[PDB]
Symmetry: C3
Subunit: 618 residues, 3 copies
C-alpha cells in the first residue's frame, strides 16, 4: 500500500457504553448524517454555513451573504454585512439565560485553591476590565498585549478586549523578554496586561521583571496592568503600572458590548513559520467563532451541561479556541488549569478530572508519553463522566493511542485525534466525537466545509482517489481560516496561497488510505514540534548566530521518543575557543534569551546548507 | 399610632373640577388601574417595563431583555441590546411630526424679554452646537462641563452633548470656582460651556470670571464656549475661548444623532453625600429616559399640548429630569425660567403661569414658605389651565399644603408631593396626578416598579405590614436608578447597596401608616437640605477647617421655619484671636470660596464629635 | 416672443433607430410616464423619493422619513434615520452578485496601455487602500486631500475614503501649489494622496513637486501617499511620504465598510463663487447617491451592461457624479480616460468609444467646438452601441448640436443637454435619454423633484406661465442638494438661500418658452466659464493684485467662439514701468502661480468698478 501506516489498520467503532451512559441526545444520528451534511457543506457552502452560523451565533445584525472571495484572491470574507460581538456570544447571552451557571472552573497550581466562576460573575469581570482599558484610552481596533499564565483573569482579558473591539495579542507566558518585545512591537500595542508573578508546578515565574525588560524597548506602551497573583515585591513604574484589583474596583460591573463587523479583527497570534521572524496570524470575528462553536459542538460533542477541560496554554491556538472560545460560545463550563500534569504528582490531570466531573479532556501526545513513562499506578480515578478524549499537535502513536484508550479512558471514551493549525482557526481533519469510527494514528475524515486534496510535491498536481500520498492542501476556503499575517498580507499570500494556486497549503504531508482516511505525515518545511510547541529551525539558528563566537548555525529536526521531534543544533565557531565546555552554557543561554527556556537546545555541537544530511546522520 | 404624623389625617380626593376642566382623556381610569399596573410592575417587571419602554421611547434597535443584574450585584442593566439617542427622543421625533410646535418657553430675568422656541428651531440649535463640539474634538464618551444659568441655551447644551454621545456634567451656576474646578477635574472634561455673565433677579453673576479662575487648575480643558448673555466686557483667553454665536454660525443646522447603547452614560451630576467630596452620580440612557417619560406621563399627567413649568435649576436633578428630559421626551412645552420668584415682585411665578397658560407647576416648599410669608395679596391670577401642583425636596407641611391647595390652586389643582433623589433618576414615591388620593405631608404611594420596604435601623430587618417606622429601602432595581459613582464604583456599592444587602438604601427614614401611605422622615445620615439645596455637613466642616485659625469644626442640622433645615457651624479656634467680630467675616467667606454663596453659614460660633448634642442644644 | 432663443425652434423626437437598436427595455414608457412621475415628485415628494431611494440604494438600516427641513431654514435632511455606505453601494453589492463584471475601463494616455478592472478587483483595491489610511490614523469624519489625474487609482481613492467614512476632498490635478494648499488647509486634511507625475496628452505633470511645495504650508499633513505612475525620480520626504504599491501590499484585500448616517458628509468639492476664495461645497451621503443613481438611470438610460464614458475630470463635479458615483452605483462599466481628445490625434475620443463599445458619452461643448474646428475627417468610426450623447457646462449652440447629432451620432443617438451645478449634486434640468423631445440650445424640462420658477431679478417676484424670462430658482429642496459650505454655513445661507427667501438661487438667468422648455442664459453673477472650468473674476483679480506693480485689477467675461467665454484682465499699474512687454510675462505667471495654468490670462491690458462697461467695450 502507498500509505504504509494504514496497512492492516482496522477502524474501531465508538464504544457502546458511550451511548448508554451519555447524559443527552447526540448531535448527529450517525455517519450517514455526517456524510449528508458534509456533502452539502462542500457542494453548497453558502446554504450550509448560513444555517450553521445562525444556529450557533447570535448576530446583532444578520449577515447578507455567507462568503465572498476566493483562495487565490486572498480576499475571503464570511458572513459579510453581519454585526456581532464575541464577548456577547461567550458571556452575555448565557448570563441572560442562566446567570448562576458555572462558566469557568479555575484549578490553581496548588490543589484545593481554585474557584468556580458563574456566567454572571464572568460578565462582571469582563465588563469592569473592559472599563479599565477604555478609561486608559484603549479603542476599537487597537491591539492589546497579554502576557498571562493559566488563570481565569486570562479569559477575562481576552474577552474584555473582544468586548471593546480591541485585538488581543496573547504571548505565551514562557516566552523571553526578547520574544515578548518582538510581538508587542510588531503589533504596535499600547497597553499590556500581565501578572506580578506566575506559579506553575510550584515554581515562580518572574513575569513582571520580564515585561519590565521588554517594555524598555516598547516605547508605545503607556500602561501595564498587573494582576496580583503572588503578592511578591516586584519593581514598579509609577505613571505606567496599574494594579488590576485597584483599577477594576473603580468601574461599573456592566459595560455595553461594542458592535463589531463580521470581518473586524478579533485577535493576533504570533506563530513561527518556515522562514523569518514569528508572524501575527490574524483571525476575524464571525467566521472564527462559527468554526470554534461548530467544532466544539460536532467534534467534541459539547452540550451546555458539559465540563470541558483542554490542557493547552492560552498562549497557543489550542488554548484560544478550546479553552476559551468554543466552550464559552456553547455555554458549557471550561476548566482553566494553572499547574502541570506532574505537580504535586503524576496523578494531577486525573485528580482534576475526577474532582470536577470533567466530560471531555483535550491534550497533546507529549504529555501522554510523559505520563505513560511515569507508570499506570498514577491513574486510579473513576472519572465516570469522561466520554471524549482529545489529542492534538502530532500523530498519536499506536502504543499511546492504546494506553489512552484503555488505561485512561477505560475503553469508555472516544479518542478524537484532531488535525489543525493556528492558521485554520479550528479542527479541519478529525473524527466527530461519538460518531466517526477511528484508526490509531489517523486523523480520519475532514470536518464540515474542509475539502482536502493530495498534491504531488513537485508538479503540484492533484492526485485523485484513495491510497495516495503527497502534500496536504484544501481546495476551498472555510469560515475560520486566518485572514492575513499582520502587517504583511504579501507574506500570507506567498506562504499559504501562492504555493499551489487555487489551494490552501498546509505545510504538511499526508496520505489518504484505501478507505479515504487521512494520515498526517508532518511538516515538509522547516517547522518542527518541540514538546508541544511550534518552532522554526531558522529561529533557533538566528539565536545561535547572535553569539559573537558563532559564524554558521544549523538546526535540524529528528524523531524523539518523548518530545516527538528532537531539534538539534550545530555550530561552526568563527575561529576557535579553548573553553568548549564553557561555550556550551553560553550558547544555551543565548537561545534562552532570544526565544525562551522551552526552546533551549538539548546540546550545541561545536564543529567546523544541506540540512537533510544532518537529520539523516542524527 | 407608630407613625404619629398620620394620626387623624384623612385622604383628600382629586377635586371634581379637575376632570370637568381637563382638556384631554386621563392616562389611567382610576386607582384600580394603578393597582393593577403596580402589581404587574412588581411581580413581572420584565413584561411591564418592556411595554412601558416601547410605549414611551423610540429605539433605533429594539432591546433584547428588559433587565439583568441584581441590587446586591451592583450590575443592573436595563433594556440591554437596545440602541437609541436621547436627543432624538427629546427633539427629532417631535420635529419630524410637528416642527412648529413650541418646545421651550424662555422666560427671561426681565418680564417681557423671553421667546418661544419650536421643536424645529430646537433641532437646529442642538445640531449646530453639537457641530461646534465635534469640530473642537469632542467625541462619544467624553464628558463636557456645563456652567450655565436658566436660559434655553442650557437645554441646547445638554441635548447637544446627548446628540454626540458626550456625557454632560452640569455644575449649578451658583457654585464657586473651587466647586466648579473640583467637578471639572473629577469628570476629566476637556470642553466647558458657560455664559459671559448671568442675570437672575436683576443681579449680575460673573460666570466667566469664575470659570477663568477654575480653569487655571483644569489644564485638560482646551476650549471654553461662551454664550453672550449680557454682552459685558469679560476677560478673554485667545486660543481657548470661543464665542457661541460665532461658532454655531459656521456649521449646518442638522447633524446626525450618534447611536448610543441603552447603557452608555448619559450624564454625571455631582452630588453631596454623607462623607467625602461630592460624587458624580452617573445615569445611563434608556432606563433614565424611560423613568423620566413614565413619571412625566403618569405622575404629572403630561399630554403633548401641555405647558409644563418646573421651578428648579438645571444644576440639580429636578431640573435635569423635569425641566429638560421628561417634558421634551413626551413632546410637550417646557418653561425655562431665568428669574427668581421675587423679581420684579412676589407675583412673578403667577405672572409667568398666567401669561403662558401653564398646566403643571413644580416647585420646592422653600419657595412656597417664602411666598406665603410675603402675603396672599401677591396672588391675583386666574391661571385657568393650572391643574397639577408639584412639590419636591422636603415634606410639604400642613399649613403650606393648605395654602398651596387653596390660595394657589383655587382648590382646582391636584397637589402631588413627589419623593425621590438624584440617585433614583425620577419620582419613586408620589401620588399620580388626577388619580391618587392624597394626605397633607405624605408622599402617598410607590411609583410603578418601586418596591419600598421599612427596615429596622440597627438590625436591618424588614418590618412588615402597616403602621411601621424605620429606614426606607427599595427591594428591587428600577430602570432609572443611578448606575455608578463616576470613577468610584466601590463607593457606589458601599453607599447604596452594601449597607443592607439585597436592598437599595435611600438614606431616609420613613413611616408607612395604617393605610399603607408613606411619610418621609428625612436623612438619617449627615446630609441636610438648606433652602432647596442638598449639602453635606462634612463639606462645610472641611471648608471651615480650610481657615488657618480653625482647628476643629462641627456643622449640624436643625429645623428652621423658612429654610426647612438650618445648618449651623461651631468652630474651635487653634489658639486665640482678639478679632472675633472680624474672624466671622473671614470664616463666612471661606465657605463662600469653597462651596458657594448659597452654602455660606448663618453664623460661625467661636468657642473651644457628638454632633447630636449640638443639634439638640440648638 | 420673450424668450427670443426659442423662436421657431421645433422639438426633435428621439430617433426611431434608438429604440430598434436598444439592447434592453427602456426605464420609462414615454413622456406620459415622466409627467406622471414628475407630478408625484412635486406634489408628494415624501412618497416619490422614498420609493426611488429604496429602488436604487441598499441601506444597512432603512430610513424613517424621506425629508425634514425647508429651503429657508437651510436645515434640509433626506432619508433621516437611514444608514448606508457609498462604497458598499458602488462596489460590494455588485461584487457580491457578479464579481467578474467589468467596473472600470482605464484608457491610458498612450493608446493600448489601459486595463479593465472587475468589481471584485475594485473591491480589493478600495479595501486595501482603505487599510492604508486606517493604519496611518485616518478616521471617520476626517477629510482626505486627493490630487490625482484620471487613472483608476483616483476611483480607488474616492471610494476608499467613502469606505471608512473619511470625507474625500478632490483637487483638480491642474491646480497650482497655492490652490492645492488653500483647499488642503481649509479642509484641515491630515492625509493626502497623489502621483509621482501625471501624463496627459504626452506631457509630464510634476504632481509630486507641486504637492511638496504646497505641503510646506500644510503642517497638519502627516502622510502623503504617492502612486508610482511614471517611475520618475521625485523628491522624497522620509517619515511622511509613502509608496502606494509598498503600503497596499501589507494589508488584506477586504475591509469592512463603515456604517454611515444618511447625512454624514461624503465629500467636499472646492468651487469658485461670485465672491471670496473658493468654497468647500459639502455633499452628504444618501441624498447625493440617490440623485446620482436616479439621474444615471433616468437621464442617461443606464442599464447594468452599459459602458459609460464621461469626459470630465474627477477634479470637478461632473467627474464626481458621472465618472464615479452614478455608473458604479448602477453597476455598469465606467471609462476612466487619462488623455486628451487631441492625443495622439483628434480621433482619440472616437478611437476609445469604438474600441470599448461605449454606449453613452458625456462631454462639454468646449471639446466639441475644438474637435469641430479640427474637421470631420477625424471621425470615421462605426460606434454601433453609442445611443446617448451628453452635453454639459454651457448651452450647446445650434451648429454644434447639429454637428454632434449628425456627424458624431449618425442621427442615431439622443442628445441630452444636462443643466446642473456642483451645488445641485446631479442633473436638475435635462431631457431624459430616449424619452424627452429636445430643442437645440435648450435643456428642456426639469428632472424629478426639481420645481423651477422664474423670478423677477430685482423684485424677486415669481413670474408665472410660459414665455417668461428672469432669474432661475427652485421652489423646493431635492435629495442631492449641497448641504453646506464647509466651515461657513452662513455663506451657504447668504449665497443660495437668503437671496430669494423660500427659493434656491442658482445664479443663472433663464427663459421658459411657449412650451414650458427652459433656456439657460448663464451666470448673472461674476462667475464665468473658461474652457470648461468654473472660475471667479474676483479670483483672477486677486491674483493680478498679488503682483507688486498692480494697484487696481479688473477681470470681465465676454463671449468667445471656442472657449465659450473669454475672461480678460485690465490692470492699472501703481506708478509706471518701462518694461511693459516684460511685465506681461510676469503678470501671466502670477495667475499661473495663484490659480493654475488653465486660468492664465489671454492678455493683461496695462492701462490706468463698472465692469459692465468693460464687457461691452470688448
Ligand atoms: C493545533 C496546533 O497548531 P500549531 O501549533 O499552529 O501547529 C499545527 C501543525 O502541527 C501539526 N499537527 C497538529 N495537529 C496534528 C495532528 N493531529 N496530527 C499530526 N500533526 C498535527 C501539523 O504539522 C500542523 O501543520
Ligand atoms: C429630588 C431632589 O433630590 P436630591 O437633591 O438628591 O435630594 C433627595 C433627598 O431630599 C429629600 N426629599 C426629596 N423629596 C422629598 C419629599 N417629597 N419629601 C421629603 N423629603 C424629600 C430626601 O431626604 C431625599 O433623600
Ligand atoms: C455641471 C458643472 O457645474 P459647475 O462647474 O458648478 O457649473 C455650473 C454652472 O455652469 C453652467 N451650466 C452647467 N450646465 C449648463 C447647461 N447645460 N447649459 C447652460 N449652462 C450650464 C451654469 O451657469 C451653472 O450655473
Amino acid at each position: 500500500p502507498v500509505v504504509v501506516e494504514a496497512h492492516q489498520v482496522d477502524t474501531f467503532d465508538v464504544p457502546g457504553v458511550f451511548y448508554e451512559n451519555h447524559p443527552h441526545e447526540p448531535h448527529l444520528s450517525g455517519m450517514n448524517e455526517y456524510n449528508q451534511l458534509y456533502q452539502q457543506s462542500i457542494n453548497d457552502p453558502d446554504t450550509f454555513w448560513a444555517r450553521m452560523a445562525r444556529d450557533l451565533i447570535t448576530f446583532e445584525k444578520d449577515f447578507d451573504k455567507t462568503h465572498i472571495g476566493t483562495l487565490e484572491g486572498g480576499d475571503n470574507a464570511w458572513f459579510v454585512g453581519g454585526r456581532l460581538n464575541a464577548s456577547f456570544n461567550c458571556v452575555d447571552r448565557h448570563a441572560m439565560r442562566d446567570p448562576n451557571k458555572v462558566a469557568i472552573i479555575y484549578e490553581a497550581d496548588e490543589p484545593g485553591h481554585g474557584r468556580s466562576i458563574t456566567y454572571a460573575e464572568l460578565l462582571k469581570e469582563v465588563s469592569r476590565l473592559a472599563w479599565v482599558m477604555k478609561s486608559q484610552g484603549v479603542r476599537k481596533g487597537d491591539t492589546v498585549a497579554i502576557y498571562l499564565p493559566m488563570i481565569p483573569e486570562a479569559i477575562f482579558a481576552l474577552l474584555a478586549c473582544a468586548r471593546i473591539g480591541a485585538i488581543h495579542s496573547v504571548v505565551f507566558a514562557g516566552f523571553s523578554s526578547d520574544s515578548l518585545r518582538d510581538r508587542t512591537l510588531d503589533a504596535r500595542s499600547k497597553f499590556i496586561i500581565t501578572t506580578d508573578e506566575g506559579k506553575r508546578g510550584g515554581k515562580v515565574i518572574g513575569t513582571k521583571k520580564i515585561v519590565d525588560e521588554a517594555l524598555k524597548q516598547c516605547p508605545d506602551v503607556t500602561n501595564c496592568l498587573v494582576f496580583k497573583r503572588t503578592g511578591a515585591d516586584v519593581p514598579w513604574t509609577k505613571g505606567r503600572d496599574l494594579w488590576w484589583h485597584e483599577e477594576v474596583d473603580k468601574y461599573p460591573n456592566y459595560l455595553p458590548a461594542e458592535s463589531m463587523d463580521s470581518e473586524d479583527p478579533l485577535f493576533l497570534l504570533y506563530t513561527s513559520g518556515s522562514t523569518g521572524k514569528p508572524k501575527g496570524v490574524m483571525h476575524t470575528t464571525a467566521g472564527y467563532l462559527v468554526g470554534a462553536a461548530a467544532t466544539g459542538k460536532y467534534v467534541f460533542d459539547i452540550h451546555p451541561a458539559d465540563r470541558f477541560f483542554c490542557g493547552g496554554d492560552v498562549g497557543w491556538i489550542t488554548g484560544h479556541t478550546y479553552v476559551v472560545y468554543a466552550p464559552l460560545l456553547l455555554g458549557c463550563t471550561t476548566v482553566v488549569f494553572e499547574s502541570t500534569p506532574a505537580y504535586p504528582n503524576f496523578s494531577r490531570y486525573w485528580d482534576v478530572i475526577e474532582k470536577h466531573k470533567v466530560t471531555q479532556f483535550y491534550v497533546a501526545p507529549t504529555a501522554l508519553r510523559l505520563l505513560k513513562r511515569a507508570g499506570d499506578h498514577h491513574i486510579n480515578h473513576e472519572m465516570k463522566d469522561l466520554r471524549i478524549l482529545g489529542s492534538v499537535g502530532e500523530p498519536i502513536a499506536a502504543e499511546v493511542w492504546k494506553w489512552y484508550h484503555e488505561v485512561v479512558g477505560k475503553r469508555q471514551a472516544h479518542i478524537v485525534d484532531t488535525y489543525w493549525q493556528t492558521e485554520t482557526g479550528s479542527h479541519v481533519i478529525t473524527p466527530l466525537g461519538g460518531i466517526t469510527p477511528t484508526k490509531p494514528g489517523s486523523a480520519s475524515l475532514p470536518f464540515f466545509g474542509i475539502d482536502p486534496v493530495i498534491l504531488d510535491p513537485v508538479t503540484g498536481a492533484e492526485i485523485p482517489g484513495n491510497d495516495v500520498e503527497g502534500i496536504l492542501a484544501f481546495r476551498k476556503p472555510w469560515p475560520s481560516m486566518a485572514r492575513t499575517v499582520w502587517g504583511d498580507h504579501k507574506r500570507y499570500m506567498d506562504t499559504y496561497l501562492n504555493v499551489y494556486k487555487g489551494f490552501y497549503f498546509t505545510g504538511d504531508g499526508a496520505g489518504r488510505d484505501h478507505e479515504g482516511y487521512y494520515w498526517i505525515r508532518g511538516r515538509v518545511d522547516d517547522v518542527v514540534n518541540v514538546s508541544g510547541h511550534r518552532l522554526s529551525t531558522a529561529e533557533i539558528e538566528a539565536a545561535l548566530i547572535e553569539h559573537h563566537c558563532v559564524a554558521e548555525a544549523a538546526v535540524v529536526g529528528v524523531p524523539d521518543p518523548l518530545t516527538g521531534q528532537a531539534v538539534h543544533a550545530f555550530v561552526a565557531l568563527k575561529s576557535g575557543n579553548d573553553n568548549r565546555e564553557q561555550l556550551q552554557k553560553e550558547l544555551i543561554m543565548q537561545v534562552r534569551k532570544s526565544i525562551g527556556p522551552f526552546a533551549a537546545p538539548k546540546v550545541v555541537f561545536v564543529i567546523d546548507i544541506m540540512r537533510r544530511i544532518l537529520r539523516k546522520i542524527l
